[PDB]
Curated annotation (Swiss-Prot), chain A:
<feature type="binding site">
    <location>
        <position position="96"/>
    </location>
    <ligand>
        <name>isopentenyl diphosphate</name>
    </ligand>
</feature>
<dbReference type="InterPro" id="IPR008949">
    <property type="entry name" value="Isoprenoid_synthase_dom_sf"/>
</dbReference>
<feature type="binding site">
    <location>
        <position position="179"/>
    </location>
    <ligand>
        <name>(2E)-geranyl diphosphate</name>
    </ligand>
</feature>
<keyword id="KW-0460">Magnesium</keyword>
<feature type="binding site">
    <location>
        <position position="84"/>
    </location>
    <ligand>
        <name>Mg(2+) 2</name>
    </ligand>
</feature>
<keyword id="KW-0479">Metal-binding</keyword>
<feature type="binding site">
    <location>
        <position position="77"/>
    </location>
    <ligand>
        <name>isopentenyl diphosphate</name>
    </ligand>
</feature>
<feature type="binding site">
    <location>
        <position position="90"/>
    </location>
    <ligand>
        <name>Mg(2+) 1</name>
    </ligand>
</feature>
<dbReference type="GO" id="GO:0046872">
    <property type="term" value="F:metal ion binding"/>
</dbReference>
<feature type="binding site">
    <location>
        <position position="95"/>
    </location>
    <ligand>
        <name>(2E)-geranyl diphosphate</name>
    </ligand>
</feature>
<comment type="similarity">
    <text>Belongs to the FPP/GGPP synthase family.</text>
</comment>
<dbReference type="InterPro" id="IPR000092">
    <property type="entry name" value="Polyprenyl_synt"/>
</dbReference>
<keyword id="KW-0414">Isoprene biosynthesis</keyword>
<dbReference type="GO" id="GO:0005737">
    <property type="term" value="C:cytoplasm"/>
</dbReference>
<feature type="binding site">
    <location>
        <position position="180"/>
    </location>
    <ligand>
        <name>(2E)-geranyl diphosphate</name>
    </ligand>
</feature>
<dbReference type="GO" id="GO:0004337">
    <property type="term" value="F:(2E,6E)-farnesyl diphosphate synthase activity"/>
</dbReference>
<dbReference type="GO" id="GO:0008299">
    <property type="term" value="P:isoprenoid biosynthetic process"/>
</dbReference>
Length: 258, 264
């Protein structure tokens, strides 16, 4: 497929419309809304939202049910990027041809746009129809863990503490897994919970996502092969989960290309 | 009186021990934990946790049960100050850990706060109420609550302020989280819906009184005169007291936190 590229395009659309609706309904300063929207509706491949939605599809449930959670995850990813680009941080000028957030709104407002997105993501998961209460709490819990001081923020702190220092492969596996792996795992995992996957299925999908993460943490002939190995290991795990995972498999193979 | 002081001191102690244990258990980099602990454990008034805990007491329930929530609120308060202190915008995180680590410390605290609430229930608080707590915290803390407050504050420093603009900034930046402390207390304590609304009115007026006194410590007096700021303060103290009575709970601890605003 083909079929799946139609699916991916359709969901990307739904995700962007939804993201735009979430900002527009905010009753708060316009400059804050603009700073949030700027980075949000700047684009990107929406890999994380698409992973969640493909996971829910793979379990036979209407991915629409997951859309608010997929948006929350994309808000979390966008926040992380905004703070990362800051001059005190990775100090980035440009992204995807666009000047970075603080370059347009100043440092203070970019910081707050981040903080607003991070907070708002938690509200999106709560505020909400037919995902059941107990599953909603678990989603929220695992989101905080993936994003928090043992997760993504732990990864970013460890990376920052990298003062022009030849780090160490294990210190770099830590940085990788926590800073980027965790949220890629969470996106799949959240889709598994929403979709109603059993515990074994969930664990196979978690392993799929880690490998996928690793392939991601590579994005030179040797590098190409390690990428290819992880993509294949991911797909092996996807297979072991007895799901309809053609969309997920294709996302996987799209990482493998290039 | 003395029973209340004993109650507030016992709750402050529990909150500080809890906060120190909440940081200690994290399995993450040492510098991030220290930066988080530094601001978080610094040990101030703990107004917000004590408000939650007093509200739970006022409803008859063991305030221990609300301790994770009171800790989550203080973590939100602490992140806001860390981010607030940055030059671009009183232990001063960024001074000691650098700006990057201070930003991340703030980010860690905000996120971790939400975790703290979900994990309750060994041990009581029912799932439906826990979702409402998270929902209302996010709204109080976020881009329509506290973060709105800080942005509106940013969106005109050097611009002179109408009293509308100054009340909005205080309502969102400071008011929402004090209000939420009482509100969450009411939900945790199983308040009747009528009592919850009265406590929310109480907390509203109390938050406003909090900032008006902050000025008079030393503006509201540049917008109202000094007599005017003082009269508005007294009004809010009187309104708060009325609502507290309308409660009607045993809010001697809440009244005592209130009269402390009324003291000076």
């Amino acid at each position: 497929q083909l079929s799946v590229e139609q699916f991916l395009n359709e969901q990307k659309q739904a995700v962007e419309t939804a993201l735009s609706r979430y900002i527009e309904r905010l009753e708060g300063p316009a400059k804050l809304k603009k700073a949030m929207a700027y980075s949000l509706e700047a684009g990107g491949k929406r890999i994380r939202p698409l992973l969640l939605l493909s996971t829910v599809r793979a379990l036979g449930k209407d991915p629409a049910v997951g859309l608010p959670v997929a948006c929350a995850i994309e808000m979390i990813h966008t926040y992380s990027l905004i703070h990362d680009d800051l001059p005190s941080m990775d100090n980035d000028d440009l992204r995807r041809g666009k000047p970075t957030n603080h370059k347009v709104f100043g440092e203070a407002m970019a910081i707050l746009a981040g903080d607003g997105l991070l907070t708002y993501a938690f509200q999106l998961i709560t505020e909400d129809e037919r995902i059941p209460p107990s599953v909603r709490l678990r989603l929220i819990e695992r989101l905080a863990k993936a994003a928090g001081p043992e997760g993504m923020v732990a990864g970013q702190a460890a990376d920052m503490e990298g003062e022009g220092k030849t780090l160490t492969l294990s210190e770099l596996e830590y940085i990788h897994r926590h800073k980027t792996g965790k949220m890629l795992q969470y996106s799949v995992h959240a889709g598994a919970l929403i979709g109603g996957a059993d515990a074994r299925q969930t664990r196979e999908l978690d392993e799929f996502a880690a490998h996928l993460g690793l392939a991601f943490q590579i994005r030179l002939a040797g590098a190409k092969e390690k990428l290819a190995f992880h993509i294949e290991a991911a797909q092996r795990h996807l297979r072991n989960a007895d799901v309809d995972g053609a969309a997920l498999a294709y996302i996987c193979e799209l990482v493998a290309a290039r």
